[PDB]
Design a protein around this ligand. Structure first.
Ligand SMILES: [Mn+3]
Ligand SMILES: [Mn+3]
Ligand SMILES: [Mn+3]
Length: 169
């Protein structure tokens, strides 16, 4: 039944999530929840974090775990100045700034809407960064699947099914 399923996915997440200090905060934020809404939010957040870490590694970027805005990222490299943007990942090499946006969407309509949003968001930054002699390389890692390197696919499936079941409530 529903209660046994939730306990079981919590156990699976607990056992089989890749031991990674970078997931422990969000892992716990998921495990402590009782209410269906919170279990969605935090479970979906946990999956998104797994994808962000993967996407940064794949693309040679630093994961933005401290939620730094672009403006702050530059201030930290002594560069002086923007639209508020908190990238999923980044790399600054001299005057070349790589920004990474990644996401997951299941339906093509949603995927496109989110792709357009992330694209325009980064394009708007490009013109403003020019004024401080920063070249922007914008990268969008748009995914249709939640599968990732932080959790076995079979665990992933059980988690999303249980989460879909919580949409009942
Ligand atoms: Mn993200
Ligand atoms: Mn750096
Ligand atoms: Mn993003």
């Amino acid at each position: 039944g529903m209660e046994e399923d939730i306990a079981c996915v919590k156990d699976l997440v607990s056992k089989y999530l890749a031991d990674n200090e970078r997931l422990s905060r969000q892992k716990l934020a998921f495990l402590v929840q009782t209410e269906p809404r919170m279990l969605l939010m935090e479970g979906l957040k946990l999956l998104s974090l797994c994808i962000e870490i993967d996407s940064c590694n794949a693309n040679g970027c630093e994961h933005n775990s401290e939620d730094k805005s672009v403006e702050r990222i530059l201030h930290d490299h002594g560069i002086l100045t923007l639209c508020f943007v908190v990238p999923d990942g980044y790399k600054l090499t001299g005057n070349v700034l790589i920004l990474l946006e990644c996401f997951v969407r299941s339906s093509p309509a949603n995927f496109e809407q989110k792709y357009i949003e992330d694209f325009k968001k980064l394009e708007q930054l490009k013109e403003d960064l020019k004024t401080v002699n920063i070249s922007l390389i914008p990268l969008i890692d748009g995914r249709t699947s939640f599968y990732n390197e932080q959790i076995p696919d079979w665990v992933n499936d059980k988690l999303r099914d249980t989460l879909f079941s919580l949409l009942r409530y």
